[model samples]
Target chain A: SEYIDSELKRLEDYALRRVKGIPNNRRLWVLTCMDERVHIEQSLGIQPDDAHIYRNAGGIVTDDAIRSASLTTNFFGTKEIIVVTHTDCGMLRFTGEEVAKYFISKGIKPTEVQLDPLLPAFRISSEEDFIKWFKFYEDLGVKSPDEMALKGVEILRNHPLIPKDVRITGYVYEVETHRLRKPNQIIYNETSKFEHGTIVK
Target chain B: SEYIDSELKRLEDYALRRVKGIPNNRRLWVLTCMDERVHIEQSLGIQPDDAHIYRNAGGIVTDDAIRSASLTTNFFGTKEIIVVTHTDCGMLRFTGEEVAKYFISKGIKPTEVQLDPLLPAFRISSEEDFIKWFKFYEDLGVKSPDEMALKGVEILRNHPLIPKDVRITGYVYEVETHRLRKPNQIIYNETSKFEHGTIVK
Candidate 1:
């Protein structure tokens, strides 16, 4: 963050501002994964003010996301949504119990982990304690990255708050390559492996 | 979408894949606005796999976002959370109810814009019907962009699901400029007029 602190000072060097608030520029919205390799804008070839973006681990469209989307579509003139996921996403990994055990191994407590660097000093009262709260991650119901994404599309399409005319679609981005796919489309590998500055493409 | 379809065919031409879903690369997560001018990665100098990004209008940290964050901090090795908002955000521009009327103006019917793009025929069953369902964007409670962002950070810090050790902070990105600052930090605009490629920085 210290590095971020220094870079932020460039405000003194250059300033660029935009003020048309209601101006309907890019009416598209995107729900996508948080995977670092997935470049939302670059992948879509969009510039700033082009779209509204809602993202989460699996890019799932949930209650809160719909709440946000309603604001854009109903008021801000946004007309469509694109749900994007990526190949080899990390959310596809993990069960709730495993995360709980890791916390317990660190001398976890039943309550929230404290702010201190090492505060497991608050011991887990018993296995019962971990069992009670670990449902946070466990209930996620592990599924393929692609499947999780379409579930999001399904939620958006049927949500009471979303406008039916708002076109919504789902995509899967291939991390090792700069390509994206619709959820159900078939994808294949052209080369056996990737190397410096070169890919199967 | 036809364009996306053609672009995806390149995937078969170039095969790319990542399988180590839980290698635990980046341990930070970011929640920020979807303003096109707000560059999430380039502005931060972050590369792929550097952090997880969650975006929505105004970058507000809502319950579902926290649910996703908990999965990261609780399950993955992620240890920090950053909430980023941008100046001159459109979310600050409208009353929730106005958003609803915008739909009606677009020929929307009472039921999910029921009648084709042309449908005044199904006039609202009654004021009761509008009252019962049109609250989609209503309770958002219009507020200053900066204040809303801070409010989001407060919710995250106080959320039961977020662990204490995880560091979380709020940032305001000056869209006119690419600088990131603490919500309350001193921000100065040195010039009133702007010229090509320059302004008060």
Candidate 2:
């Protein structure tokens, strides 16, 4: 601990001098998967302190995620949201109730089957949603990486909590190569410019 | 998209040849924050495919996070979980309801406050011994980097679903210097040797 502690101080002093307060600087918020290979900065070519980034399995947007978004959009001056999903994600193996099946086979119980807390079971309204909204968030059958990213954007774009003024969009990060691209489908209305590029990426 | 399409194959072929598959070699699972500064493997000197890492705003252990642990624990062979928090975290700025306050002040309405879809407005069971269990999950008064990490571990360590044998612990990554340390408190039983070393550091 001593050796590491001192080394930290040295690095902190040398590296963070130009770095100023409280992380996000790009006024941009990013949502991406927790894949080790997906270094948000390196893969997206963004700088540290550039954007507020959040991740979970599949890089799906969850309510708790929006909680962070609400803070950044309202308080930090963030004007855009970018959701990035990648190729060959581990979560890709299972979909919907299948997740529970895998857990059950492991001996995890029903009440204990907390698959994704962000999308925790809840009652949704009719027409546009269901009680659980589980199907709404479930993307097992989603066709492409962009499709996944869009589903994520839709949650925020239509969210009662997020202001329509705070632009939202989606992308697919090709983990193999450090790159990102627009989801196949995007509403020009959601974001402006390469708002895709606003990821500080 | 066409130019990008070919690059992915070349990179995938170039990158993943040595990578046999997704399961971590160490059977390790890391829960860490979404901060761009967190390069879990490189900063720690760990290799790719060494551990399953999950990230979110605070790296708090949400149910979905464990669903991952459960999958790896029972299926992919993960045996350890490490929660990492860091200094200069934005989450340190405010507490529970304060988040909604910020959003509300921004013109967001009541219907917009959909946070932690799973833990939506609950009456705590009043667990006789729950210590910051709510506070453990609560980020309001968390004053330091270390405090947040420990709070995250407590939730999982006592969760009815987590297997006692799975071994869970936490660390505070000095965001300033890229180093990780015990949260000023640790259970000797969880991970004794190489807890820091396990970071692939």
- DockQ for the candidates, in order: 0.20, 0.27
Model 1: clashing residue pairs?
A16-B176, A16-B177, A17-B176, A48-B36, A48-B37, A49-B36, A96-A138, A201-B14
Per-residue lDDT tens digits for candidate 1, residues B1-201, read: 998987776543223322332423557888887666677776666775678888766676544466567777766557888888877666554443565566566654544433111112222344334432222212444355566667767777876567888898887777756778776674465344563565687
TM-score of chain A of each: 0.65, 0.66
TM-score of chain B of each: 0.65, 0.64
lDDT of 1 at B189: 50
Residue B168 local lDDT, model 2: 87
The per-model lDDT (C-alpha) reads: 0.61, 0.61
Q: TM per model?
A: 0.64, 0.67
Model 2 lDDT, full chain set: 0.61
Which candidate has the highest TM-score of all?
A: 2
lDDT of 2 by residue, A97-147 (tens): 655454456665554343333223332223222112232233435666677
State the lDDT of candidate 1 residue by residue for A8-75, as single tens digits. 76443223222333433568888877766677777877776677777777665544466567666755
lDDT of 1 at A125: 41
Give the TM-score of chain A in candidate 1.
0.65
